[PDB]
Amino acid sequence: PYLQIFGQIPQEDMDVALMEHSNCSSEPGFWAHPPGAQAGTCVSQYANWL
Amino acid sequence: NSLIRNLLDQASHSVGHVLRMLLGPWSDLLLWALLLNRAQMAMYFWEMGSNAVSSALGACLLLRVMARLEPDAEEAARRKDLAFKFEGMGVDLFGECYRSSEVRAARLLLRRCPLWGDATCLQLAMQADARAFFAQDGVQSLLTQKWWGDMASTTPIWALVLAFFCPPLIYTRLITFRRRCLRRWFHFWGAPVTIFMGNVVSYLLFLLLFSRVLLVDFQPAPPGSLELLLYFWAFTLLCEELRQGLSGSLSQRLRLYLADSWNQCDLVALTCFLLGVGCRLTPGLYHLGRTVLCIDFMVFTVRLLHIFTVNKQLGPKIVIVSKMMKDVFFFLFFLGVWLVAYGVATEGLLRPRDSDFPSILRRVFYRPYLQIFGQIPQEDMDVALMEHSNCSSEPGFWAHPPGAQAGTCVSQYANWLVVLLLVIFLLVANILLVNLLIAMFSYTFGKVQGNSDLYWKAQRYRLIREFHSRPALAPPFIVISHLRLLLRQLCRRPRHFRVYLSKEAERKLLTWESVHKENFLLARARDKRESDSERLKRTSQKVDLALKQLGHIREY
Amino acid sequence: IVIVSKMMKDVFFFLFFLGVWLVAYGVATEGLLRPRDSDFPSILRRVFYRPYLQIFGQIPQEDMDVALMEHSNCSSEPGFWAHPPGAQAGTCVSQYANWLVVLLLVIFLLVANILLVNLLIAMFSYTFGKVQGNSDLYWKAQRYRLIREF
Amino acid sequence: KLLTWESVHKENFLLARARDKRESDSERLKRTSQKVDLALKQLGHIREY
Ligand SMILES: CC(C)CCC[C@@H](C)[C@H]1CC[C@H]2[C@@H]3CC=C4C[C@@H](O)CC[C@]4(C)[C@H]3CC[C@]12C
Ligand SMILES: CC(C)CCC[C@@H](C)[C@H]1CC[C@H]2[C@@H]3CC=C4C[C@@H](O)CC[C@]4(C)[C@H]3CC[C@]12C
Ligand SMILES: O=C(COc1cccc2ccccc12)Nc1cc(Cl)ccc1C(=O)O
């Protein structure tokens, strides 16, 4: 988020629309594993609009 | 001693023309006190002397150039605030004659004085650096009218440019003025504003043509028609620059022409173009010729910027931008030191195996410089975004990066410290630097606008003068005007405003300005008699006089 | 509202300066580097559009620096070309003076993103400080006019 | 009613301004100068004594 100030905005890592949907976790939810290296191997998307 | 007898002995044993003319009526005692720096004597001599304009103006020329020739601080200072107050009460002397008779003041300006050497008040002002005189609204209006000479100085700009584009439009209901042919034609084509418009159109056409030749038609092949006509245009431009340097005593003219740094950049631009043409014509230096022509486009275009300055809504601010250069120097120095620091720190922490001199020089300055403008190689610097490998034989983790010039084989041992240093760099440079810079820009801009405007008045005046001196024709066709003026020098081998004023109209104007000047004397006479401090003084010498009178009758 | 209406002279000022400086730098760049796609629309794009986005973080460094491109003989004219990976930056760029190319790019970034914008910032600050009271009184008048129509 | 009201208020305003230029410092210097040179004149009228 500090790089977020200076134009380094990981939009493709943060927005559900830009990441491909997959069942990367066993928890009953929608995840859509992002392609970022240190953005987490399996993130959630329940309130990604928020 | 001082500046009187030493200079008089110098003249006897021997602006400089004035000293030669003088040797050992109201004008005579006037100049005597001005050389002798008798302040009160001098103001009295002037006030009860003739040609009050013109003469406070000549005396202020002498005062200013004298304070410039004065080796003593005190006489320079007293001489210069004498110049200040003389010029001030002269400019409102001119204002009171101006608000009384517009045309009479106008014809007061362009009057020939048998005084200090036949320099019109405008020349007196420029040589005296009378920026206050120039900024005076009356002379501002007169110079505006001259810049629009015979061109209906109140005419709209759009009508004028449409008239320039449509020569038949000159004979219409629009664009009024002051063989109606030929004469109207010459007045229009010789008006300084039309000269400026034509010059701007010509410069724009030249820059378009030169860009077109550079971009599409600059093959290694021998130059074509476009390039040849470009060379011809540039030869015309070189000719006009050298001829205006030679026109506006050949050595003296050259030396004064080395001044006016605008002219200096124009000359360096043309010298660059000559070298570019030489490199182009020689087969070997073709790529070098291309590069030098490209960098020459820079100086042409930046010269156009100073060419366009005359605009009233633009000129003061263009003068402004010329005062930020020290600020950008400061911020440049500080960015440079902080930048070279951070870069050396980065290539010290991380060890690329591409330790080449050009690669290191790139990586240490160029990339971190782009890190300010959003080009941050995060995926090239952080260990968490990049893949690990056994790249180098040196013991330690290396993790070859995916970058092209970030070094083929980086080190990651203290990459956490590398990340922290990157955070510190982003905190300092992207936040502190530019922001303190824009704050001090705001300060320096708020402290310089007024003297930029008053300077712009005189700058615009100088531009109008030189453009009035410029030949009528346009740079594309300025070959005809060059053959004319060369013939004006070549048909001389076998062979600035100056509006005349009438006799006894000289007496009318002098008395009129004499009447007005004595009215201004008596007006500031009431002003000082009613001033609060002087009225307190007056009450003092009416009450001390009263007490003296009581003392005279005290014996009663 | 009156202030943002009055700032129009200042925005004109910045527009003219930006335009002259961008056309300068764009022509210099298209001269110093020689794509083989010298079409009229392509040149028109590359000379104004891209250098305009150069001010807002859209830097085609991978399209203009020799250190980030791959070298190939994409043109018959003698000299190294190193075809770029871009889409409209030309199919075959020239690299003869790419060091000077980088230097001129640095000069552009220094002049544009520092000098012009920040001087314009000061220009707005000044013109906002000098006309706010007149804007308020004119707003009183204009509000009266507006309620008159309503 | 409104005419006389605004006229009364206007004459109070004229009297307020008349007195305001009767304690203003510049006009007080003016009136003090008038008093002092009137004193000079009247002392002149008794100088013959
Ligand atoms: C005020 C002017 C001089 C600024 C410079 C702008 C120049 C560089 C721009 C404006 C229009 C552009 C032209 C647009 C179309 C063409 C036709 C093509 O077949 C050759 C290139 C050429 C001629 C372009 C060259 C660059 C160009 C001429
Ligand atoms: C903050 C300011 C000073 C940044 C300056 C950036 C300069 C130093 C950068 C930008 C491009 C870089 C150049 C890129 C190409 C070359 C050509 C090579 O044959 C010598 C190194 C040299 C010349 C590099 C040296 C460093 C360099 C000139
Ligand atoms: O043209 C200039 C200055 O031009 C430049 C200055 C600094 C760097 C430059 C780099 C490239 C091109 C031009 C540059 N004119 C003036 C400068 C001052 Cl201080 C006063 C009067 C004038 C004037 O023209 O009257």
Author numbering:
A (entry chain A): 970 to 1019
B (entry chain C): 470 to 483, 503 to 512, 558 to 711, 766 to 835, 851 to 1097, 1108 to 1168
C (entry chain D): 920 to 1069
D (entry chain D): 1120 to 1168
Could you share sentences copied from the article?
Transient receptor potential (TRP) melastatin 4 (TRPM4) protein is a calcium-activated monovalent cation channel associated with various genetic and cardiovascular disorders. Genetic defects in TRPM4 are found in patients with inherited cardiac conduction disorders. We determine three cryo-EM structures of full-length human TRPM4 embedded in native lipid nanodiscs without inhibitor, bound to NBA, and an anthranilic acid derivative, IBA. We determined cryo-EM structures of full-length human TRPM4 in endogenous lipid nanodiscs in apo (HsTRPM4apo), IBA (HsTRPM4IBA), and NBA (HsTRPM4NBA) bound states at overall resolutions of 3.7, 3.6, and 4.5 Å respectively.
The anthranilic acid derivative NBA is a potent and specific TRPM4 inhibitor, but its binding site in TRPM4 has been unknown, although this information is crucial for drug development targeting TRPM4. Analysis of the HsTRPM4IBA and HsTRPM4NBA structures revealed discrete densities for the IBA and NBA molecules located at the periphery of the inner membrane leaflet in the pocket formed between S3 and S4 helices, S4-S5 linker, and TRP helix. The additional ring of the naphthalene substituent of NBA was an important fiducial marker for the overall placement of the ligands in the density maps. In both HsTRPM4IBA and HsTRPM4NBA structures, the hydrophilic anthranilic acid moiety containing acidic, amide, and chloride groups faces towards the cytosol interacting with charged amino acid side chains from TRPM4. Notably, the anthranilic acid moiety interacts with His908 from the S4 helix, Tyr1057, Gln1061, and Arg1064 from the TRP helix, as well as with Ser924 from the S4-S5 linker, and Ser863 from the S3 helix in both structures. Our structures show that the naphthalene substituent and the 3-iodophenyl ring of NBA and IBA bind into a hydrophobic pocket between the S3 and S4 helices of TRPM4, making hydrophobic interactions with the residues that decorate this pocket, including Val901, Val904 and Leu907. Compared to wildtype HsTRPM4, NBA dose-effect curves on single variants of the HsTRPM4 channel show a drastic increase (up to one log of difference) of the IC50s for the NBA, suggesting a decreased efficiency of inhibition by NBA. Compared to the wildtype construct, but also to single amino acid variant Ser863Ala and Ser924Ala, a more pronounced decrease in the efficiency of NBA of up to two logs of difference is observed in the presence of the double mutation Ser863Ala/ Ser924Ala. Based on our results and these previous studies, we propose that the binding of NBA or IBA to TRPM4 may restrict the movement of the TRP helix, maintaining the TRPM4 channel pore in a closed state even in the presence of activation stimuli.
